[PDB]
Amino acid sequence: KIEEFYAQFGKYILLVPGKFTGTVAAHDLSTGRTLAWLAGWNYGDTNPIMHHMAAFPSPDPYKGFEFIVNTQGGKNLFIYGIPTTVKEPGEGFNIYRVRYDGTKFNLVSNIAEKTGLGLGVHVTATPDGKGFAVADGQKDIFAEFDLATESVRTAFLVDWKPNNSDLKRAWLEGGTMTITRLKPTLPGGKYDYTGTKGCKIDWELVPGGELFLEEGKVTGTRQTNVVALDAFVYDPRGRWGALSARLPGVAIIFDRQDWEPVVALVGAKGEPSSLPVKKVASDTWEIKMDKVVTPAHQAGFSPDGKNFLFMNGVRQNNIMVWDTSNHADPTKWTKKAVVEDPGWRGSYPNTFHMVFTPDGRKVYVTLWWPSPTPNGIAVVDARNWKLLKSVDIGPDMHTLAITYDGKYVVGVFSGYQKTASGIVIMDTKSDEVVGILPSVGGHHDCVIVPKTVEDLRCSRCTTT
Amino acid sequence: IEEFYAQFGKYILLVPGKFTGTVAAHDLSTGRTLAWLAGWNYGDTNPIMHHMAAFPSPDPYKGFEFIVNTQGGKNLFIYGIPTTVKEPGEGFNIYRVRYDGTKFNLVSNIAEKTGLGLGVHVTATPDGKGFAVADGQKDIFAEFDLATESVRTAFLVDWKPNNSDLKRAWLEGGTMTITRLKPTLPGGKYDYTGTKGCKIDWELVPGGELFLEEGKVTGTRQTNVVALDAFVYDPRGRWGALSARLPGVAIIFDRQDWEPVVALVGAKGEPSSLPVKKVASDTWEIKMDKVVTPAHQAGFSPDGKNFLFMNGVRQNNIMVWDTSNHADPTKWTKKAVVEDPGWRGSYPNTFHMVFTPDGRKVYVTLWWPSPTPNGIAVVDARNWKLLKSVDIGPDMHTLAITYDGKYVVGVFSGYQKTASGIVIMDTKSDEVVGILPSVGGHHDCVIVPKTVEDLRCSRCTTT
Ligand SMILES: [Cl-]
Ligand SMILES: [Cl-]
Ligand SMILES: [Cu+2]
Ligand SMILES: [Cu+2]
């Protein structure tokens, strides 16, 4: 009886978005029941590509909890191989606040309509549980929002000016990244970025597809200006957040106290630890790069904040580690280790999404490949920075969460929106898969509802 | 966990999602979802994925096909989702989907091809080469040929009340008219796509049969609704039983010449049957002096010798006929009625069913509105007594069984808003072995058959 397996897992609620299913759901891992779900198209969102999410601390998640889940829109419908005849996809890019009340989900608000900012990639909660960030890699905008007031705390645009305007060499041969703090342009203090407004490229750079833009496979109005912002992850000690830009392979560290970028960490192995940021106007900063060696994927801080990880991808596939023990000065954060493996020397697998154990001693990293190679989970020693093991799971692996007692990693794989999908559970003492639960979802995320701010240190806050 | 799934065997579960808009296949041997499809990705803007049946495949893991249909229109507005949509998609599609060992492929929309948009139960024929679909807003059913995607037969069923007052329109009886339909558009197409033909604006929801007489359902032909629900097949061949929920009748059709032959009356205390009189080359009538209670699901046992029909709401019971005479459905007589004092209220309703392959037991869901736990009744199908009731979860729907007869698999659906899942029950102990998570509002579920014999225990002989 599976109840014996569920009794081991504990009282934890898994949230998942469905990508092309258009759903979001919560599953009680102590009983195997789905507690509630919501289907975006029921509400008249005609292109509900439910993408990323983060949940806030709830002292008792079974009585109620809240979360943010966002969507993509426009031509993002057409890039996963589904033979649809749709000609006019919905504009999408919604950011929804959803509250579970102990019985059902309630769609509380559409923060993208309220604020004017439609952003479609990672959603992260702040370490205090009272705000959240959302980034978008077609618009290259991110923003932090106050949850209670459903308002914008700050929003920034990041732009690339390539050294070589040749699309194939626009990143390799370097460029200048310009960071601008945005101000609302419409009545009510609203921004003008709903739906597809602001997209530099007509659809996202898909998993494993960062070089598709330079290889001429993605259309858009400002192709050589894209940086592909992906997430803003938070130092659990406070003060700093890290904005990942996939194409230049940089993590820009912002000071959340005065909302300014302070240094840019450079992913690639062999490249400097960081580059400086120069303030050039009241609201504008720049970073200059003489070259870009490789794009990058996901970033994260360890639970104590003293390590920061950034995954180089495609041209290099490795885990880059900085010593971030100096909380006072991120200009002093230096590369300390790089995890590499002879099996990672091809274009794939990419070192992808991560989750640390609460004690910080191990980090679990998904290994992504295109069809048909089985995707998996790498287990890394987060003290000596060594690969310990790799386990195969299934096609199209995405994110990992962990139960807050440290005992089980929970991941999702998503079938490239058309083949096998599921929720995988891994025991962190044996590092073996306990098994798979069925899942109708193309999830690119998953979160376990936290009870406390200390749980956010191992949630969709410190890492993606 | 591997221990858990290993017990079940290599059986694939298909589910539709209702308000999720999806259909999915789950491999019960590993826990993996093999493939899913989201209707709205194809431009179906109101994909209320409702009912389904799968056809026998020699190796489901390499490929199989099934039909899944949808509802549409204001059916979006009746499960308490606070949507601001004003113009819901027309829906009422009938999709043929093929798994190819990797993914689902949307093959065709048989509603667009034929012009018959029908949104309630889908049943495979016993030989696996055709399927029926009924609709309880339009009160039409049709049997289709799979290979040519064409209509074999189509009927309309209508009510003429004795008492035109809507509260009395069924209680005081009426005449049920059955008419063979013919296509009205060029190219042999019917004119029933979308909401065309709806006598009421949305379906009578689970447990909600008396909502129409209670004035809770808009539409232009309220007092003429019978709420056809499904066409289930005698596994011995020849006969099919069309259930009409509001008169509480199961009309038996001869598939050979497509005529109705006898009408079984569900209610306890009522005759076994009423005769069906021919009044024109394409028209038959059944006259009822009263309707005692509405009815729900119907089914034949695997050997065809028993037929069940669930009375609901005014009576909640399992009516059982002796159908052992295959030659003559006018000899089919009431032989037993399964009752329990705990079913004396309006709820629970005795609902969907599955029999064990050897015909020894039948599992019957027990439906209630929120917040009462819904469950499974286990019934001894030799002496027609209730053995056990087990509580599962809110809003229980259908049941399937693995073809080796070892596990009943069911779904519960949260009223489209609260808890849902897949439940697996061991048929030796009659205990629940586990719940698996499911993002679904499913009103159906099927395990992909390998043979025609498997259809005796699938979405063919019963709902
Ligand atoms: Cl904070
Ligand atoms: Cl047949
Ligand atoms: Cu993604
Ligand atoms: Cu239904």
Q: What is the Cα–Cα distance from B27 to A85, expressed in whole angstroms?
A: 29
| SS3 at position B73 | helix
**CB neighbour list of residue B257: distance below 8 Å, 6 or more residues apart:** none
| SS3 at position B42 | helix
Q: Could you tell me the CA-to-CA distances from A444 to A52, A57, A95, A396, A464 in Å, in that order?
A: 7, 22, 16, 9, 10
Contact between B309 and B298 (Cβ < 8 Å): yes
Residue A84, burial from CB neighbour count under 10 angstroms (0-12, 13-18, 19+): middle
**CB neighbour list of residue B67: distance below 8 Å, 6 or more residues apart:** B52, B53, B94, B95, B96, B97, B110, B122, B131, B133
Contact B420 A33 (CB under 8 A): yes
**Which amino acid belongs to residue B311?**
N
Q: Which regions of A267-385 does DSSP assign to beta strands (E)?
A: 274-276, 278-281, 284-289, 296-301, 307-312, 318-323, 334-339, 350-356, 362-368, 375-381
**Which amino acid belongs to residue A349?**
P
User: Residue A25: its chain B contacts at CB < 8 A?
Assistant: 437, 439
CB burial of B90-128 (b: ≥16 within 10 Å; e: otherwise) equals bbbbbbbbebeebbbbbeebbbebbbbbbbbbbbbbbeb
B83 vs A20, A44, A47: nearest CB: A44
Residue A133: closest CA among A208, A275, A232: A232
DSSP string, B307-355: EEEEE-SSS-EEEEEE---TT-GGG-EEEEEE--GGG-SS-PEEEEEEE
**CB neighbour list of residue B254: distance below 8 Å, 6 or more residues apart:** B238, B239, B260, B261
Q: What is the Cα–Cα distance from A54 to A73, expressed in whole angstroms?
A: 19
Q: Could you tell me the CA-to-CA distances from B303 to A238, B274, B323, B380 in Å, in that order?
A: 70, 24, 10, 15
Q: What is the Cα–Cα distance from B173 to B156, expressed in whole angstroms?
A: 19
Q: Residue A234 has which token pair? A: 């938070």
**CB neighbour list of residue A283: distance below 8 Å, 6 or more residues apart:** A180, A181, A183
Q: What is the DSSP letter of B3?
A: H
Cβ neighbours around A142 below 10 Å, total: 30
Contact A23 B22 (CB under 8 A): yes
Q: Phi and psi (nearest 5°) for B75?
A: -60, -20
Contact between A37 and A105 (Cβ < 8 Å): yes
Q: What is the Cα–Cα distance from B380 to B391, expressed in whole angstroms?
A: 18
**Which amino acid belongs to residue A430?**
S
A52 is in an annotated binding site: no
Contact A22 B43 (CB under 8 A): no
Q: What is the Cα–Cα distance from B403 to A283, expressed in whole angstroms?
A: 68
Q: Residue B255 has which token pair? A: 């598939």
B26 is in an annotated binding site: no
Contact A439 B35 (CB under 8 A): no
* Chain mean position to CA A429: 26
**Which is it for strands A229-234 and A175-181: parallel, antiparallel or unpaired?**
unpaired
Q: What is the Cα–Cα distance from B82 to A109, expressed in whole angstroms?
A: 12
User: Residue B414: its chain A contacts at CB < 8 A?
Assistant: 34, 36-37, 104
Q: Could you tell me the CA-to-CA distances from B395 to A31, B205, B215, B423, B436 in Å, in that order?
A: 17, 11, 24, 12, 16
Q: What is the Cα–Cα distance from A17 to A446, expressed in whole angstroms?
A: 7
Q: Ligand 3 mean position to B297 CA, how many Å?
A: 44
Q: What is the Cα–Cα distance from B143 to B123, expressed in whole angstroms?
A: 9
The partner residues of B459 in beta bridges, in order of sequence, read: none
CB burial of A387-412 (b: ≥16 within 10 Å; e: otherwise) equals beebbebbbbbbbbbbbbebbbbbbb
**CB neighbour list of residue B196: distance below 8 Å, 6 or more residues apart:** B117
Q: How far is B441 from chain A (nearest CA, A)?
A: 9
Q: What is the Cα–Cα distance from B253 to B242, expressed in whole angstroms?
A: 8
**Which amino acid belongs to residue A268?**
A
* Chain mean position to CA B195: 20
Q: What is the Cα–Cα distance from B393 to B358, expressed in whole angstroms?
A: 28
Q: Could you tell me the CA-to-CA distances from A371 to A201, A242, A418, B452 in Å, in that order?
A: 24, 31, 11, 35
* DSSP H or E run through A398: strand A397-402
Contact A1 B434 (CB under 8 A): yes
Contact between B119 and B203 (Cβ < 8 Å): yes
The H helix count followed by the E strand count for chain A is 3, 32
Contact between A461 and A449 (Cβ < 8 Å): no
The answer for B92, left when phi > 0, alpha when psi is -120 to 50, beta otherwise, is left
A35 vs B83, B102, B419: nearest CB: B419
**CB neighbour list of residue A232: distance below 8 Å, 6 or more residues apart:** A122, A124, A133, A135, A142, A144, A241, A242, A243, A244, A254
Q: What is the Cα–Cα distance from A174 to A271, expressed in whole angstroms?
A: 13
Contact between A16 and A443 (Cβ < 8 Å): yes
Ligand nearest to the CA of B413: 4
Residue A110: closest CA among A58, A205, A197, A44: A44
Q: What is the DSSP letter of A396?
A: S
Residue A178: closest CA among A274, A289, A285: A285
DSSP string, A197-249: TT-SSSS---TT-GGGTTTT-S--SSGGG---EEEEEE-TTSSEEEEEETTTT
User: Residue B41: its chain A contacts at CB < 8 A?
Assistant: 20, 77, 82, 84, 86
Residue B172: closest CA among B273, B291, B274: B291
Residue B220, burial from CB neighbour count under 10 angstroms (0-12, 13-18, 19+): exposed
Q: What is the Cα–Cα distance from A441 to A17, expressed in whole angstroms?
A: 7
* Chain mean position to CA B407: 21
**Domain B2-457 - what CATH class?**
mainly beta
Q: Residue B210 has which token pair? A: 């008396």
Alpha carbon distance, N-terminus to C-terminus of chain A: 34
Contact B45 A41 (CB under 8 A): yes
Q: Could you tell me the CA-to-CA distances from A97 to A105, A107, B99 in Å, in that order?
A: 10, 6, 36
Q: What is the Cα–Cα distance from A171 to A201, expressed in whole angstroms?
A: 15
The H helix count followed by the E strand count for chain B is 2, 32
For chains A and B, what is the number of CB pairs under 8 angstroms? 171
Tell me the HSE value of A163 on the side-chain side, using a 13 A CA sphere: 13
B32 vs A2, A46, A436: nearest CB: A436
Domain segments of chain B as ranges: 2-457
* DSSP H or E run through A176: strand A175-181
Resolution (A): 1.5
Q: What is the Cα–Cα distance from B120 to B138, expressed in whole angstroms?
A: 10
Contact B31 A425 (CB under 8 A): no
Q: What is the Cα–Cα distance from A390 to A388, expressed in whole angstroms?
A: 7
Q: Residue A340 has which token pair? A: 């590499």
Q: Residue B453 has which token pair? A: 């014999």
Residue B50: closest CA among B455, B461, B441: B441
A327 is in an annotated binding site: yes
Q: Ligand 1 mean position to A238 CA, how many Å?
A: 6
**CB neighbour list of residue A308: distance below 8 Å, 6 or more residues apart:** A242, A251, A265, A299, A300, A301, A302, A321, A322, A324, A333
Q: What is the DSSP letter of A112?
A: H
| SS3 at position B171 | coil
Nearest chain B residue (CA) to A29: B437
Q: What is the Cα–Cα distance from A401 to A408, expressed in whole angstroms?
A: 9
Residue B446, burial from CB neighbour count under 10 angstroms (0-12, 13-18, 19+): buried
Residue appearing with tokens 């929720």: A423
Q: What is the Cα–Cα distance from B110 to B93, expressed in whole angstroms?
A: 7
Q: Residue B153 has which token pair? A: 């037969």
Cβ neighbours around A187 below 10 Å, total: 6
User: Regarding the domain delimited by A3-456, which CATH topology (the fold level of the hierarchy) does it fall under?
Assistant: Methylamine Dehydrogenase; Chain H (2.130.10)
**Which amino acid belongs to residue A185?**
T
Residue A158: closest CA among A121, A127, A126: A121
Q: Phi and psi (nearest 5°) for B42?
A: -95, 10
Q: Phi and psi (nearest 5°) for A200?
A: -85, -30
Contact between A78 and A416 (Cβ < 8 Å): no
Q: What is the Cα–Cα distance from B293 to B304, expressed in whole angstroms?
A: 25
Alpha carbon distance, N-terminus to C-terminus of chain B: 31
| SS3 at position A452 | coil
Q: Residue A361 has which token pair? A: 């001693």
Nearest chain A residue (CA) to B24: A440
Contact A34 B414 (CB under 8 A): yes
Residue appearing with tokens 């039948």: B362
